Amino acid sequence: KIEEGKLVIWINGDKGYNGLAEVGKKFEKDTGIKVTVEHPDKLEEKFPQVAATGDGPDIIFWAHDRFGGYAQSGLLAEITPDKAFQDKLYPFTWDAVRYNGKLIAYPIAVEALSLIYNKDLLPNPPKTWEEIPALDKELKAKGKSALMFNLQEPYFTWPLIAADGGYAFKYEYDIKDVGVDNAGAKAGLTFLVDLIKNKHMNADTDYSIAEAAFNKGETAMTINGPWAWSNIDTSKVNYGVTVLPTFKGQPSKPFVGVLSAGINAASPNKELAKEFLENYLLTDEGLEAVNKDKPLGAVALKSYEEELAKDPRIAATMENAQKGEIMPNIPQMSAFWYAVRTAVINAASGRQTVDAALAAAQTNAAADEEDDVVIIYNRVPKTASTSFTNIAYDLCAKNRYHVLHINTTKNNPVMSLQDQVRFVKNVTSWKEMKPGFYHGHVSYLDFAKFGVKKKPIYINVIRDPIERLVSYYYFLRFGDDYRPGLRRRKQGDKKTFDECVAAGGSDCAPEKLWLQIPFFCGHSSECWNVGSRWALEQAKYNLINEYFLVGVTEELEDFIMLLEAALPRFFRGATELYRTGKKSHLRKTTEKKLPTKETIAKLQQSEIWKMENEFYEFALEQFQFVRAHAVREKDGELYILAQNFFYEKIYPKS
Amino acid sequence: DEEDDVVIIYNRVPKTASTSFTNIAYDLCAKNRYHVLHINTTKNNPVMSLQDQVRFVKNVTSWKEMKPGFYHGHVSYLDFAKFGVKKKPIYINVIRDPIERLVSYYYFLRFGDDYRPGLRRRKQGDKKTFDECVAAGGSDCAPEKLWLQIPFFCGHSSECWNVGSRWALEQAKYNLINEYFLVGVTEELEDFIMLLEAALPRFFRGATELYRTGKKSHLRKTTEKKLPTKETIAKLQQSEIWKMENEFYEFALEQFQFVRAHAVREKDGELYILAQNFFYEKIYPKS
Amino acid sequence: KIEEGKLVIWINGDKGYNGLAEVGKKFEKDTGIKVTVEHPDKLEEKFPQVAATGDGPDIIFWAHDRFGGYAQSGLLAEITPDKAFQDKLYPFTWDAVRYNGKLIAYPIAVEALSLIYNKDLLPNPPKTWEEIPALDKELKAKGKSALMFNLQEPYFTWPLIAADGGYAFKYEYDIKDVGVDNAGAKAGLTFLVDLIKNKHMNADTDYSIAEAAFNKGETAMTINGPWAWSNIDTSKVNYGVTVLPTFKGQPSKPFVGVLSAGINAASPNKELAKEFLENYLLTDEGLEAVNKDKPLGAVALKSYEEELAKDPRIAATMENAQKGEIMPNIPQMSAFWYAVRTAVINAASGRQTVDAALAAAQTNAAADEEDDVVIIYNRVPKTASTSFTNIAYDLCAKNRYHVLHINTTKNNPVMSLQDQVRFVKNVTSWKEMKPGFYHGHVSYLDFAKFGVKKKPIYINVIRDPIERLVSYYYFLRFGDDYRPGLRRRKQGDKKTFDECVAAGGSDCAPEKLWLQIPFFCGHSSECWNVGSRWALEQAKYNLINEYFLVGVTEELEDFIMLLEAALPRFFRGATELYRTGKKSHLRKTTEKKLPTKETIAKLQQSEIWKMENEFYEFALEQFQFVRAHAVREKDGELYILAQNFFYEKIYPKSN
Numbered sequence A: 001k002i003e004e005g006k007l008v009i010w011i012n013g014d015k016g017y018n019g020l021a022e023v024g025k026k027f028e029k030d031t032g033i034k035v036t037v038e039h040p041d042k043l044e045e046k047f048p049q050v051a052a053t054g055d056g057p058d059i060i061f062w063a064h065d066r067f068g069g070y071a072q073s074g075l076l077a078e079i080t081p082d083k084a085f086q087d088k089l090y091p092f093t094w095d096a097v098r099y100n101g102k103l104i105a106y107p108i109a110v111e112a113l114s115l116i117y118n119k120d121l122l123p124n125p126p127k128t129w130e131e132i133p134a135l136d137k138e139l140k141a142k143g144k145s146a147l148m149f150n151l152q153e154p155y156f157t158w159p160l161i162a163a164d165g166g167y168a169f170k171y172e173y174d175i176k177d178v179g180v181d182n183a184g185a186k187a188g189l190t191f192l193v194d195l196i197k198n199k200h201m202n203a204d205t206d207y208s209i210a211e212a213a214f215n216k217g218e219t220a221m222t223i224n225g226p227w228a229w230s231n232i233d234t235s236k237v238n239y240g241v242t243v244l245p246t247f248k249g250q251p252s253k254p255f256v257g258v259l260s261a262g263i264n265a266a267s268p269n270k271e272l273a274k275e276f277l278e279n280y281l282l283t284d285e286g287l288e289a290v291n292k293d294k295p296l297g298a299v300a301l302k303s304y305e306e307e308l309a310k311d312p313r314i315a316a317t318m319e320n321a322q323k324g325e326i327m328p329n330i331p332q333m334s335a336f337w338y339a340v341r342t343a344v345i346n347a348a349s350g351r352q353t354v355d356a357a358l359a360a361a362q363t364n365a366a367a368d369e370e371d372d373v374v375i376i377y378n379r380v381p382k383t384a385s386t387s388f389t390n391i392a393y394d395l396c397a398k399n400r401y402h403v404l405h406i407n408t409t410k411n412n413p414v415m416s417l418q419d420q421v422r423f424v425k426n427v428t429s430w431k432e433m434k435p436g437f438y439h440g441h442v443s444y445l446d447f448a449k450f451g452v453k454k455k456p457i458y459i460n461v462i463r464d465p466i467e468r469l470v471s472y473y474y475f476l477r478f479g480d481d482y483r484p485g486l487r488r489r490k491q492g493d494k495k496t497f498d499e500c501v502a503a504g505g506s507d508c509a510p511e512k513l514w515l516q517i518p519f520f521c522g523h524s525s526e527c528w529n530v531g532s533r534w535a536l537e538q539a540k541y542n543l544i545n546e547y548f549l550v551g552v553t554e555e556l557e558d559f560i561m562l563l564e565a566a567l568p569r570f571f572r573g574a575t576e577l578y579r580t581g582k583k584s585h586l587r588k589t590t591e592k593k594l595p596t597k598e599t600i601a602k603l604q605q606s607e608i609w610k611m612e613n614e615f616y617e618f619a620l621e622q623f624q625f626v627r628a629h630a631v632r633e634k635d636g637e638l639y640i641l642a643q644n645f646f647y648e649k650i651y652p653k654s
Numbered sequence B: 001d002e003e004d005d006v007v008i009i010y011n012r013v014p015k016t017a018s019t020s021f022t023n024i025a026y027d028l029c030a031k032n033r034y035h036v037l038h039i040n041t042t043k044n045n046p047v048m049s050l051q052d053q054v055r056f057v058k059n060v061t062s063w064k065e066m067k068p069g070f071y072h073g074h075v076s077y078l079d080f081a082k083f084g085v086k087k088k089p090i091y092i093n094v095i096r097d098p099i100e101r102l103v104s105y106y107y108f109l110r111f112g113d114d115y116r117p118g119l120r121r122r123k124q125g126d127k128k129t130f131d132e133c134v135a136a137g138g139s140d141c142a143p144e145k146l147w148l149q150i151p152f153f154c155g156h157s158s159e160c161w162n163v164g165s166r167w168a169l170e171q172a173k174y175n176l177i178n179e180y181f182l183v184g185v186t187e188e189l190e191d192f193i194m195l196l197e198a199a200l201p202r203f204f205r206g207a208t209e210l211y212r213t214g215k216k217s218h219l220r221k222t223t224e225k226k227l228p229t230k231e232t233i234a235k236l237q238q239s240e241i242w243k244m245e246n247e248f249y250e251f252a253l254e255q256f257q258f259v260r261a262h263a264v265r266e267k268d269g270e271l272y273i274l275a276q277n278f279f280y281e282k283i284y285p286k287s
Numbered sequence C: 001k002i003e004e005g006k007l008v009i010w011i012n013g014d015k016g017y018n019g020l021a022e023v024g025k026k027f028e029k030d031t032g033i034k035v036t037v038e039h040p041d042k043l044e045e046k047f048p049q050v051a052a053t054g055d056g057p058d059i060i061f062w063a064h065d066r067f068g069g070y071a072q073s074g075l076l077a078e079i080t081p082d083k084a085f086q087d088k089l090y091p092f093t094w095d096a097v098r099y100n101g102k103l104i105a106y107p108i109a110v111e112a113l114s115l116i117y118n119k120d121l122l123p124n125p126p127k128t129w130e131e132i133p134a135l136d137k138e139l140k141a142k143g144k145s146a147l148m149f150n151l152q153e154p155y156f157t158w159p160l161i162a163a164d165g166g167y168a169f170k171y172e173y174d175i176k177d178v179g180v181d182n183a184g185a186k187a188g189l190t191f192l193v194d195l196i197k198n199k200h201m202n203a204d205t206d207y208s209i210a211e212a213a214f215n216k217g218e219t220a221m222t223i224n225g226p227w228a229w230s231n232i233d234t235s236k237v238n239y240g241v242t243v244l245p246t247f248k249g250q251p252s253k254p255f256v257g258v259l260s261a262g263i264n265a266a267s268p269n270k271e272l273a274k275e276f277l278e279n280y281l282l283t284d285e286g287l288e289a290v291n292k293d294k295p296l297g298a299v300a301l302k303s304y305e306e307e308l309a310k311d312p313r314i315a316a317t318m319e320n321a322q323k324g325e326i327m328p329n330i331p332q333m334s335a336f337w338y339a340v341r342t343a344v345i346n347a348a349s350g351r352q353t354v355d356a357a358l359a360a361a362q363t364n365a366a367a368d369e370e371d372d373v374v375i376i377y378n379r380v381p382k383t384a385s386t387s388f389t390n391i392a393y394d395l396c397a398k399n400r401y402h403v404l405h406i407n408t409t410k411n412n413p414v415m416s417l418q419d420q421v422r423f424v425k426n427v428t429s430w431k432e433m434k435p436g437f438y439h440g441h442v443s444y445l446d447f448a449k450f451g452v453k454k455k456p457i458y459i460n461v462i463r464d465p466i467e468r469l470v471s472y473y474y475f476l477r478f479g480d481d482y483r484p485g486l487r488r489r490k491q492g493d494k495k496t497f498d499e500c501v502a503a504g505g506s507d508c509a510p511e512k513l514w515l516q517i518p519f520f521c522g523h524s525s526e527c528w529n530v531g532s533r534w535a536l537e538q539a540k541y542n543l544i545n546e547y548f549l550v551g552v553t554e555e556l557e558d559f560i561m562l563l564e565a566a567l568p569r570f571f572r573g574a575t576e577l578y579r580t581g582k583k584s585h586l587r588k589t590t591e592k593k594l595p596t597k598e599t600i601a602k603l604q605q606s607e608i609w610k611m612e613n614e615f616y617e618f619a620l621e622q623f624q625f626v627r628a629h630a631v632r633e634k635d636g637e638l639y640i641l642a643q644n645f646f647y648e649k650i651y652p653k654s655n
């Protein structure tokens, strides 16, 4: 849906979008590519929201803290600037946009909150936060106010919270150790609430109210960033940009954002976007053109920053920037800001107490039990399991999960009751392996019987009974190409499969077709009773009732595509890895001889075959139905369907 | 504290008095302190995509501010076990005689109802009566159209929607017994409500009183209905699709009757709910 | 996964692991067995994680307080030192590692926290805790500090908490009446928080910060154990090891740990481990070799302790040791330390108030973690149930669980919907009966429908349909020998079973064979429809899908043997009790007359029998399969199989 041959750019409303559009017309005049710059409402959390119905922009502009969640969702393309370009930008800004080892955005400028005071109304600004209730007294009698800023966003509130000792995820890597309810956090927020209790400030004060109250000279001070400097100049109000006040003798620690430009992973114009950012924007001409509209702060470009650093206002921004901390780009930051936004608004409107509001936001920040998942792939031999499992291995590091292989003595697929109990205990209570992907040639094991809290997710892949047996036959004879060093068990057997069947051999007897059924039937006796009608039926019921998804070998690509859509925690990027990996067809059996029409015909006379086949076509028909209902075929490739349900008539209201 | 972590799912079957029952939940939810949400699916398709299944399950179980909750909607039975949740929801349902339900649904699309008489229904402007349609071998009254209540219990498996499937029938019965907390029948809706008030009083405290004295007990009557000829019903009953859809009904019915028979006492006039009939003894160690 | 023919040993990081490795090289030189000594991070938490998977070290070194949870989880092997060895170690240290009557670890040394002060910076150390805020004043002006120790671990914090009257589990046998929120506990902790409020100490002070601040002579005092003495000697800082200060005139009561070595239950080298500990470590040569790396404190070996007791520092350690208390080895100690660790850190960072933090930790110490299990034995009449159940009754006291019997009106096996809901609610939310063993003649009830968190574990025992009917026949007529006082229902009926069948009697009609199927089929209508094909099939599906194990009467001994191996919490010692108990064949029907070949032949013509029998043989063939895969027949008897799986190729790696 993103138009090719043009660039669409989304940048925040309060920034210099008119200035960026100037650089857009210089790119259009030079390359012929139309550049459209827009500033949609609420793009902090609603960039992939409304993009679930329509694919849009090529370049996205925001602070680097969001760009990690975008990256993990696969919404960004890994940018590739040459080292000649990386050396003209501050190395620390590149770290701000480095997620999982690779770069995901082009760092533009470094923004930070500073204290802005009215030179006329207040010659000497307060050094501390405590001398503001006393300062508001005299200004209230005149008809003014001591301070006015955005209380609806936790961005402006955080410097006071992190002042005395508040923090979010301690930087050791960062852990799930949130400190929004410690001494410093509670003390900082409580003082802010007492400023509204004593009516030194209004709890409904947003951005527009704050900006208007200052530019019209109704309030002495305000808190904002570089982007609000241009709007004060048009008011002729003499102001000054200084260092943030100190709470409890502690310097305020504002969160430092780095304005970054990332490239949409869906954008077809990734080459036009790369050229625009590197050659037209991230240059002295481009940055100055945007700076004329709304100040960017301290740019990441070495060249243009040497000239901006000679500014009394930029000096104050980089001062507060060093007092504060650069935000993490971890995906938890999206849930962090939401949690704090809620705690701040509630504490300010009296709808909740400071002690309780921060205690609630304490646990909304991380540890949402999204990490407590376990997949079991009880892989069936010679069904392309090696190729699939290696996707799990390649993604586990990046997608943050663990992959373990289960080994059983003499490869026996049935566990002893005591071993079943231990396995179940392990899978479920081995916290340090969650989320986890256990795999191995084990028969289906039912966790319900053992009274666990949470069952694991079962998936599998099966193959045509005869083609699997034949593949397995020649496998023991000749081995594979994944590990060609192992000498297989029945190596040194010359007879071919077709020759064996005709000779009534034991390795190619129909009874040897019975495997995929017991693998689903489980550790019950009747499952391994070869040719059991009960075993068949039970194997079907388990595949329907207990297996999350079971695909077929010969359609493994679609199987992986569906898992990436359903369980993206485990399989984000699995499809791309499969299509462009060279590790997609692992463990080919070295020397295979496909069976004669005559050989296949004789196997098909066996009831053991008729059943093992019936199960296959059952599991196949099922997969084909699952896919059919999950995708849409829009000329060529399949595309995963959007969300097709919603909730309505929700009472009581509210 | 209180047991607030409960979620009921009523995957309502079309034209089975579901509007009447659901409005009880709506009337009591405020007073009994719970939430009632309606599930809407694109084009009314009762089967969710795998990715939508995961989302729905995730919501139901982890949407804390809607607990306890009563989700309802025309969705085929969805098994939460597969997705490895901590706590399964409680499934309840109400089914109706296969033929009487189809006929009711037939005239519904033709003429609409009285609950929302403003909506123009999909096949409105079709004059043919049900009986005439069957005799003319119409599409809307083909025996294949009887197949609905079975898949609604069978679920999101392929074989469920394979019309006339013997496997689908068997699975549908197994689900009704193993997964559904209680499934009652339309024509005995009062008793179904009475049992729910006794079993799940958090949701249905005062539901029976509300039903008996409410004037909101018979909602969404199909405006113009013509009951089928003995001849029309007789021809439908020749179809295996009917024989199966009926077999399932009588199965579910026989079950409900059994459940009720063991929960109530028939003493001179009205049924009375049975007291507690078990206790614990020989409890060691002492302490 | 544990390699055979070598020893792997895990010991804590702050201990003398390089010294132990010296003893490893002397064992390798002598026996040829390679010994590898490692010191993993979070060792106390890592061991049970790893050892559960059937992996880990052969020998594990920690204080004895953890070793009970390890034992109950079956992660330790019962050690067997001869009396000749037990008599060269202090008898009280053997009590420190005695859990459930048996020994589970080899006690090494007795460690206890003492006060360490800088001789130069402070000639006369304070005897009370209160004269520290006053002492920190003068040292702050000089550029020093009064005290610096680990606040991140409740081990160092506990002496101040237990000082005025704080405690954990009162000793009656230990009770589960926790006192981490009483007067002494709150008073002790509040004073600690006031030391951070008044900025006499930092709330982020861990172990490394504490040790560095003292060894560099930046702080006057510190709190630690014997293992930290070696690191101060390398700083040339003149120190002294004295008795812990007194809070509110009460001597500080530090928790006393006993460094113990236990043998991994999964280790194949249990004989090599036993020889290493007894002959190479727990000897004067071995302990001295470790002691020279990091001091052990007061060793448990009588021989080497007589020489260490002549030490000014060891004298102070054994002083504080007697002031304090030896930690319990109960499994609850793992949940206790967690609860206190949380309360302390929160109170210290202002994240929570002392009153509130200890009140929260008060109820976290009784954490029913692995104790949340419930078995339901819905016993079938006349199937040796009384005999089996009495094993549960005899073990429940000792194995720490509860046994409840379920009684139903007129012994009707089907519950009303409202009763089903109540029963399910009880079973799952009746916390004071967990773990529990509910039993009674109730039909199978499916807990899944009701949306519970955790399902109970279902087990059962069935009997041959005809033999059960006959037994139940004569039972109503003549009664049993377990309770011979009860006058049975149909007592005073003379007709024998064989004569009844021939006469087409009501009590021996084929319809009466239908019982074991509905009991598994459940509370659904079709189950009690006699002769139902659907009921049969469902009964089979329930036995496979829902029942943890169903055994048969005539092989009850093996059923019990498997349960002891699978659910040892409930049935540890059940097999021994059965074989040597005289309470193994309870409730024999007084007067029985076995059926004629003619009588049995007529019953077998009935479809009701053919089905009820088909179910039996199904359940039987299943049990035989379960046993077959769980045991090994090594001449005559049966022996439970070892662990036969393991995890490998575990990515991502650490590292």
Ligand SMILES: CC(=O)N[C@H]1[C@@H](O[C@H]2[C@H](O)[C@@H](O)[C@H](O[C@H]3[C@H](O)[C@@H](NS(=O)(=O)O)[C@@H](O[C@H]4[C@H](O)[C@@H](O)[C@H](O[C@H]5[C@H](O)[C@@H](NS(=O)(=O)O)[C@@H](O[C@H]6[C@H](O)[C@@H](O)[C@H](Oc7ccc([N+](=O)[O-])cc7)O[C@@H]6C(=O)O)O[C@@H]5CO)O[C@H]4C(=O)O)O[C@@H]3CO)O[C@@H]2C(=O)O)O[C@H](CO)[C@@H](O[C@@H]2O[C@H](C(=O)O)[C@@H](O)[C@H](O)[C@H]2O)[C@@H]1O
Residues within 6 Å of the ligand: A381, A382, A385, A386, A387, A389, A390, A405, A407, A409, A410, A411, A476, A483, A486, A487, A488, A489, A490, C648, C649, C653
């Ligand atoms: C310890 C260590 O440090 N290790 C190093 C090292 O890591 C290696 C491991 O050492 C190595 O074990 C492991 O192998 C894995 C393998 O990678 C894995 N691949 S998978 O994930 O893609 O699946 C997996 O491979 C399996 C296959 O999945 C199975 O299909 C296959 O089963 C076969 C079986 O082989 C057949 N047997 S055969 O005929 O003898 O060949 C056959 O089954 C037989 C069965 O064997 C018989 O027992 C049975 O016998 C009877 C008898 C009687 C009887 N009757 O009477 O009826 C019937 C049967 O018969 C059956 C049969 O006939 O079927 O068929 C099976 C299939 O059906 O087995 C495997 C296979 O490929 O052959 O599992 C194996 C393990 O099993 O790999 C790792 C690895 O990481 O590559 O090297 C790495 C370096 O790469 C080190 O890692 C580094 O560590 C560093 C560190 O120190 O931290 C770190 O810094 C580095 O970053 C890191 O890379 C690692 O440390």
Ligand SMILES: CC(=O)N[C@H]1[C@@H](O[C@H]2[C@H](O)[C@@H](O)[C@H](O[C@H]3[C@H](O)[C@@H](NS(=O)(=O)O)[C@@H](O[C@H]4[C@H](O)[C@@H](O)[C@H](O[C@H]5[C@H](O)[C@@H](NS(=O)(=O)O)[C@@H](O[C@H]6[C@H](O)[C@@H](O)[C@H](Oc7ccc([N+](=O)[O-])cc7)O[C@@H]6C(=O)O)O[C@@H]5CO)O[C@H]4C(=O)O)O[C@@H]3CO)O[C@@H]2C(=O)O)O[C@H](CO)[C@@H](O[C@@H]2O[C@H](C(=O)O)[C@@H](O)[C@H](O)[C@H]2O)[C@@H]1O
Residues within 6 Å of the ligand: A648, A649, A653, B014, B015, B018, B019, B020, B022, B023, B038, B040, B043, B044, B109, B116, B119, B120, B121, B122, B123
């Ligand atoms: C957004 C808004 O405006 N919100 C306002 C508003 O609230 C409204 C909602 O707007 C409104 O949507 C909702 O309606 C509910 C309804 O109330 C509910 N009733 S129930 O609880 O008793 O059940 C429920 O009704 C359902 C029935 O349950 C269903 O049976 C029924 O399904 C029918 C379907 O309609 C048929 N379609 S038709 O023929 O086209 O008519 C048919 O299904 C069709 C399907 O539709 C077709 O698409 C499909 O097509 C094909 C084509 C081909 C093909 N093939 O080839 O094979 C197959 C199929 O075919 C199928 C089919 O033929 O089967 O039959 C179905 C039955 O089988 O649908 C509904 C019905 O009654 O028609 O759900 C609906 C929603 O769906 O009601 C609320 C409400 O509260 O009343 O207004 C309220 C005020 O009244 C506002 O509330 C206020 O909010 C304020 C605020 O917060 O801002 C607050 O301040 C105020 O206090 C508060 O009051 C609210 O904001």
Ligand SMILES: Nc1ncnc2c1ncn2[C@@H]1O[C@H](COP(=O)(O)O)[C@@H](OP(=O)(O)O)[C@H]1O
Residues within 6 Å of the ligand: A380, A381, A382, A383, A384, A385, A386, A387, A471, A472, A475, A553, A554, A556, A584, A585, A586, A587, A588, A589, A590, A592
């Ligand atoms: N992406 C893929 N699609 C279809 N078959 C695949 C595949 N990757 C591997 N295979 C096949 O799967 C078999 C290996 O199975 P497994 O990995 O479970 O041991 C081999 O079969 P062949 O013997 O026909 O070569 C291999 O060729």
Ligand SMILES: Nc1ncnc2c1ncn2[C@@H]1O[C@H](COP(=O)(O)O)[C@@H](OP(=O)(O)O)[C@H]1O
Residues within 6 Å of the ligand: B013, B014, B015, B016, B017, B018, B019, B020, B104, B105, B108, B186, B187, B189, B217, B218, B219, B220, B221, B222, B225
């Ligand atoms: N309390 C009740 N008992 C029996 N049938 C009822 C009922 N309340 C509503 N119905 C019927 O149920 C149908 C409506 O179903 P639903 O509410 O699911 O859409 C209508 O059927 P008819 O078409 O026969 O009139 C309506 O008459």
Ligand SMILES: Nc1ncnc2c1ncn2[C@@H]1O[C@H](COP(=O)(O)O)[C@@H](OP(=O)(O)O)[C@H]1O
Residues within 6 Å of the ligand: C380, C381, C382, C383, C384, C385, C386, C387, C471, C472, C475, C553, C554, C556, C584, C585, C586, C587, C588, C589, C592
């Ligand atoms: N260890 C054991 N092995 C086999 N049967 C036993 C047994 N202990 C008791 N029984 C038998 O079990 C029946 C009692 O069942 P229950 O305890 O459930 O009421 C009696 O059967 P008989 O009637 O043949 O004597 C009793 O003999």
Ligand SMILES: OC[C@H]1O[C@H](O[C@H]2[C@H](O)[C@@H](O)[C@@H](O)O[C@@H]2CO)[C@H](O)[C@@H](O)[C@@H]1O
Residues within 6 Å of the ligand: A012, A014, A044, A063, A065, A066, A111, A153, A154, A155, A156, A257, A337
């Ligand atoms: O307040 C939550 C919000 O804070 C930050 O957003 C800032 C942004 O960094 C600035 O560039 C400017 O737009 O002000 C915003 C706040 O109004 C975080 O960047 C963002 O993730 C978070 O939602």
Ligand SMILES: OC[C@H]1O[C@H](O[C@H]2[C@H](O)[C@@H](O)[C@@H](O)O[C@@H]2CO)[C@H](O)[C@@H](O)[C@@H]1O
Residues within 6 Å of the ligand: C012, C014, C044, C063, C065, C066, C111, C153, C154, C155, C156, C257, C337
């Ligand atoms: O602090 C919790 C912790 O306390 C004890 O651990 C001690 C251990 O006994 C000492 O040998 C040394 O290692 O210091 C440890 C604390 O850092 C308990 O033994 C242990 O169970 C508990 O977790």
